[PDB]
Design a protein around this motif. Structure first.
Motif, short mmCIF file in Angstrom:
data_model
loop_
_atom_site.label_atom_id
_atom_site.label_comp_id
_atom_site.label_asym_id
_atom_site.label_seq_id
_atom_site.Cartn_x
_atom_site.Cartn_y
_atom_site.Cartn_z
N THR A 68 0.80 -1.21 -0.07
CA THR A 68 -0.07 0.04 -0.05
C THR A 68 0.87 1.32 -0.10
O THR A 68 2.11 1.24 0.24
CB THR A 68 -0.66 0.16 1.36
OG1 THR A 68 0.07 0.10 2.52
CG2 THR A 68 -1.44 -1.21 1.50
N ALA A 77 0.94 3.56 2.21
CA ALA A 77 1.31 3.97 3.67
C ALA A 77 2.46 3.00 3.91
O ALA A 77 3.42 3.50 4.65
CB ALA A 77 -0.04 3.83 4.54
N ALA A 78 2.38 1.75 3.39
CA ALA A 78 3.30 0.82 3.99
C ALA A 78 4.65 1.33 2.94
O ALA A 78 5.78 1.15 3.68
CB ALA A 78 3.01 -0.41 3.39
CL LIG Z 1 -1.00 -0.05 5.38
#
Ligand SMILES: [Cl-]
Ligand SMILES: [Cl-]
Ligand SMILES: [Cl-]
Length: 124
Positions: free
Chosen positions: A3, A5-6
């Motif tokens: 993702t 965010a990751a």
């Molecule tokens: Cl995430």
């Protein structure tokens, strides 16, 4: 796929150290975070603060992103960061980076729910 965010965490967070203490820090971290896998990522900054403190930047000063987007946020205080940049003599797969440690405000782009950092825009 990772993702957004990751991917930000993986590319930019280094809470295990207070700051880069060696000129070799970037060569090691760029490799350890798999940023030299297919190529040598040219520039990358690591932030040496807790994840919670970096996520909190998304509730701080709203500023424009270099790209004109308006979902960027500038930290109220300065943070410990390390800028990693390929040197003139870097060639994949023999990536070589210059390590520059500093204390600056960070600017990140935030998105989602929860609204978290998705990109590192710049430092000041
Ligand atoms: Cl995430
Ligand atoms: Cl990975
Ligand atoms: Cl970066």
């Amino acid at each position: 796929k990772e993702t957004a965010a990751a991917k930000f965490e993986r590319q930019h967070m280094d809470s295990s150290t207070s700051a880069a203490s060696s000129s070799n820090y970037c060569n090691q971290m760029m490799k350890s975070r798999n940023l030299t896998k297919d190529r040598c990522k040219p520039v990358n900054t690591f932030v040496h603060e807790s994840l919670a403190d970096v996520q909190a930047v998304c509730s701080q000063k709203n500023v424009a992103c270099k790209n004109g987007q308006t979902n960027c946020y500038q930290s109220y205080s300065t943070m410990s960061i390390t800028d990693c940049r390929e040197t003139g003599s870097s060639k994949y797969p023999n990536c070589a980076y210059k390590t520059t440690q500093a204390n600056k405000h960070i600017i990140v782009a935030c998105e989602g729910n929860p609204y978290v950092p998705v990109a590192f825009d710049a430092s000041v």
